Amino acid sequence: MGVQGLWKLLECSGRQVSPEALEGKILAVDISIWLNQALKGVRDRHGNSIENPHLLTLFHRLCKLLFFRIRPIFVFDGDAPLLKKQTLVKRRQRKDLASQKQQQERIAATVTGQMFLESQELLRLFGIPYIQAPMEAEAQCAILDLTDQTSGTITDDSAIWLFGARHVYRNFFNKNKFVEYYQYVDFHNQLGLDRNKLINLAYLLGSDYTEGIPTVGCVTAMEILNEFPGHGLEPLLKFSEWWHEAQKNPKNPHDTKVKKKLRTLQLTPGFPNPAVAEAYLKPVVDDSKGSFLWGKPDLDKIREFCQRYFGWNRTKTDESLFPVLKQLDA
DNA sequence: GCAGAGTT
DNA sequence: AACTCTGC
């Protein structure tokens, strides 16, 4: 999910790009969102469903990555931060209800750990390196972008910006939507957004770490952050103070139309929660400096894997592998 | 405060 | 087509 309307606000800075512009670059790829999407499969066959669709999509996307001379570093999620789980609990408390938590995590754990073993097997056969992030994989990609270990990161999760990412390629594994390239420098110089502003935007709009303010979108959020200017987390403190005294027997000394609009919307009794900004500023990553290597694939292991998990014969796997090996010449 | 308008 | 955000 990421941040609610962050991509809408940032889109003025992005640059449309042909997939051949990623040729040659080393890039990290968050895979844990692919497994969380092919968790319970899809019935796309004209009469039935697929067995291991996560492996199938992984294979197709590995083929597309190698077709464009990309050198990917896959990053797997680790544990979930406490705030992520609490927000997934409060977003599950709205289960369409009007007028069993210890057996769901334990099933998700083992099912996703088997998906992990399968995916890592396929990645090893393709000779591409991967890393098990300690908690968050988007922060683990951001720390690689910052340390100049990658030329960017392929992801659609806007929340990576809040972890300090600098270069991002988005809509790459989308067919109809053009690939788009975003640089922190460009939208910093355009929109005046640094990391702290983006974190306050996550406070207002909502993310996996906190639910936002029900009325506000990116426009109202930017109007707020520009109406209470400050450093770091100060703007939200000023906003909370002003809103508490605003909802204190009021009756007006020419409040700006934005402040006429903000007295309406409601706030959580604990807003703001500095643990959110802390979890975005100082997350858990591998500070290690890596030396990544990309091995040559071997078609026999790949064909055995394809036959064991999808039931493909040599001439189908080979047909879907013809262009990849064609490009991998020098 | 209403409906135009962007999104899934 | 509903859901939601926001200029008029």
Author numbering: 1 to 99, 753 to 904, 908 to 986
Text of the article:
The overall fold exhibits similarities to other flap endonucleases but XPG harbors a dynamic helical arch that is uniquely oriented and defines a gateway.
Crystals of the I422 space group contain one complex in the asymmetric unit, hereafter C1, while those belonging to space group P4212 contain two distinct complexes, termed C2a and C2b. In all cases, the arch helices are fully ordered and adopt the closed state, though α6 in C2b is halfway tilted towards the open state. However, the DNA in C2a is tilted by 7° towards α1 and away from α12b, relative to C1. Furthermore, the DNA in C2b binds XPG in the opposite orientation, with the major groove facing α11 and α12b, while the minor groove faces α1. As compared to C1, its trajectory is tilted by 15° toward α12b and away from α1. Modeling of an ideal B-DNA on the experimental substrates shows clashes with the α12–α12b loop in the case of C2b or with the β-pin in the case of C2a. Moreover, the α2–α3 loop, which is only partly ordered in one of the six DNA-free molecules, becomes fully ordered in C2b by inserting into the DNA major groove. Besides, the major groove binding mode likely represents a non-productive complex.
